Amino acid sequence: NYEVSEKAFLLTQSKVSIEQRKEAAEFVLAKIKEEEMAPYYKYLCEEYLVNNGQSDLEHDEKSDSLNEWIKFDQELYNELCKKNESKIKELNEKIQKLEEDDEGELEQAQAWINLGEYYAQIGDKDNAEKTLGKSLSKAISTGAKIDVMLTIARLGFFYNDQLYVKEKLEAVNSMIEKGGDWERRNRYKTYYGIHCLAVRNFKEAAKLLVDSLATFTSIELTSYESIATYASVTGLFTLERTDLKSKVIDSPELLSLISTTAALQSISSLTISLYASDYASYFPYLLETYANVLIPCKYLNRHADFFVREMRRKVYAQLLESYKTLSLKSMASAFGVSVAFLDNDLGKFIPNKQLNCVIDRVNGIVETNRPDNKNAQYHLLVKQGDGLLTKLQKYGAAVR
Amino acid sequence: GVEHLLRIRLTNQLKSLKGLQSKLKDVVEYLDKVIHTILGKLQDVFNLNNLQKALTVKTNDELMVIYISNLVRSIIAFDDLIENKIQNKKIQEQRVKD
């Protein structure tokens, strides 16, 4: 189900090539024949508008699109009824006979789950959760628990809903805690780091992603190259260079992951340039990471500017720690940028107290302000010490 | 056995001040008694922000670190005051219903 949501997401924003939309349309047309995408197929016009979202022959009549395959017709209307009779009408009649004959226990619960998964592809979520809720009481061990969690896990990836999914996934996992192997636990662990990108948790996302394996592929839930970009980009932003040398840049799987596909451009272009402290070619890597990684990915396109703006602030901190002073002529020219471009980035960073530095105008020397023995007891002990005392006085001043 | 039969800062400053008063009388009386060997021993102790000016800068930095520990321990004692205030209400709530 994720293969369609990944390819059709390129239909939303394409600023360069038109063929990217037609190439991604070939994967959509192939999957809609085997499985009915009608809930997401109708969600195409309800997601992003004023591109392809105005083209429909049924609910709303307008023609504006670069893709004519997303509009209903007489063929898809007949196929919608054929898939609805086989996956629901034909299967429910056989399950109804098993209910009266009393055949098995978990077999009827698993049959309701497989039947409930078909309502998700027809576009009716009321009967999908109704048949799933009846089979939830029959779940005891991890045999029927994986299938119940699998249906709710689809709600997050297929319907792109971060609200009612995680609340249900946590309730099912916390009811009976076993986990089976480590891969069945990834469904809760991988979606955890993915949900952190919606509410912008930053370093919290990479907690379970860095320790996760790079060979994990959920197919219909997620692809191989999609999860590879989530752990590479978020893991690089979380762990500092101290932890990058013993984990990211040197790993048995990660070194094998970068050679599989060239669509990462994170653990190779960004990591080596950061480890070698080469700022000449490091700047164009951020543009390739933004265009060819962040934009095509689903959850990596939500932040947008929040990647390059924050990553550029931290890469300067690695340079400020290795020198007391610097050269403004070398930073604003030799690294591939201009003078006005450097003052715009550092202009917003200084008043936010995100770093300690000394910028020179006439002399043109970038000097680092080093606390020496001050460290974390200088401005943090007074701010965090007295700041928490303000929260302590909240309930003590007003009582109840 | 002594403790069974019997069942600070101000005193330290009083005897320390009297040490200079008693020493001053010993020098004046010895001055008129002669008219240097005895006064030489007292001069050895008397001579050995005058000499601490070099360590005065490092002393204030250590006094602040001491206050850091005292500030944290003071907050711990302040949390028990709010905890006991809420606990005192639980006793009052039982007196109203009963």
3-state secondary structure of B36: coil
3-state secondary structure of B35: coil
CB contact under 8 A, B85 and A377: no
This PDB structure is determined at a resolution in Å of 4.2
Whether the Cβ atoms of residue A108 and residue A99 lie closer than 8 Å to each other? yes
Spatial CA neighbour of A200 closest among A306, A47, A337: A306
Residue A300 CA to residue A70 CA, distance in Å, equals: 25
- φ/ψ (deg, to 5) at A367: -110, 140
Q: What sign results for the dihedral spanned by CA atoms A236, A238, A244, A247? A: negative
- φ/ψ (deg, to 5) at A269: -70, -45
Residue A62 pairs in a beta bridge with A56
Residue A358 pairs in a beta bridge with A367
Distance from CA of A396 to the nearest CA of B (A): 7
3-state secondary structure of B50: coil
Angle (nearest 5°) at CA A381 between A377 and A385: 165
> Counting every residue, how long is chain A?
400
Residue A325 pairs in a beta bridge with A367
- Extract the tokens encoding B38: 């005895």
Whether the Cβ atoms of residue A232 and residue A266 lie closer than 8 Å to each other? yes
B62 has a chain A CB within 8 A of its CB: no
Question: DSSP letter at B76?
Answer: H
Q: Where are the beta strands (DSSP E) in chain B?
A: none
Spatial CA neighbour of A205 closest among A214, A216, A195, A218: A195
Those of residues 58-117 in A touching chain B at CB distance below 8 A are: none
Spatial CA neighbour of A66 closest among A79, A53, A75: A53
Residue A334 CA to residue A362 CA, distance in Å, equals: 18
Residue A143 CA to residue A106 CA, distance in Å, equals: 9
* Residue of A381, A392, A395 with shortest CB distance to B68: A381
3-class SS string, chain A: CHHHHHHHHHHCCCCCCCHHHHHHHHHHHHHHHHCCCHHHHHHHHHHCCCCCCCCECCCCCECCCCCCCCCCCHHHHHHHHHHHHHHHHHHHHHHHHHHHHCCCCHHHHHHHHHHHHHHHHHCCCHHHHHHHHHHHCCCCCHHHHHHHHHHHHHHHHHCCCCCHHHHHHHHHHHHCCCCCCHHHHHHHHHHHHHHCCCCCCHHHCHHHHHCCCCCCCCCCCCCHHHHHHHHHHHHHHHCCHHHHHHHHCCCHHHHHHHCCCCCCCCCCHHHHHHHCCCCCCHHHHHHHHHHHHHCCCCHHHCCCHHHHHHHHHHHHHHHHCCCCECCHHHHHHHCCCCHHHHHHHHHHHCCCCCCCEECCCCCCCCEECCCCCCCCCCCHHHHHHHHHHHHHHHHHHCCC
Q: 């077999």: which residue's tokens?
A: A107
B77 has a chain A CB within 8 A of its CB: no
For chain B, what is the radius of gyration of the CA atoms? 28
Residue A254 CA to residue A212 CA, distance in Å, equals: 11
Spatial CA neighbour of A290 closest among A319, A310, A317: A310
**CB pairs < 8 Å spanning A and B:** 11
Residue B74 CA to residue A368 CA, distance in Å, equals: 36
- Maximum Cα–Cα distance for chain B, whole Å? 92
- Extract the tokens encoding A90: 């034909």
CB contact under 8 A, B79 and A392: yes
Backbone break loci in chain B, preceding residues, C–N > 2.5 A: 7, 35, 48
Question: DSSP letter at B49?
Answer: -
CB contact under 8 A, A395 and B82: yes
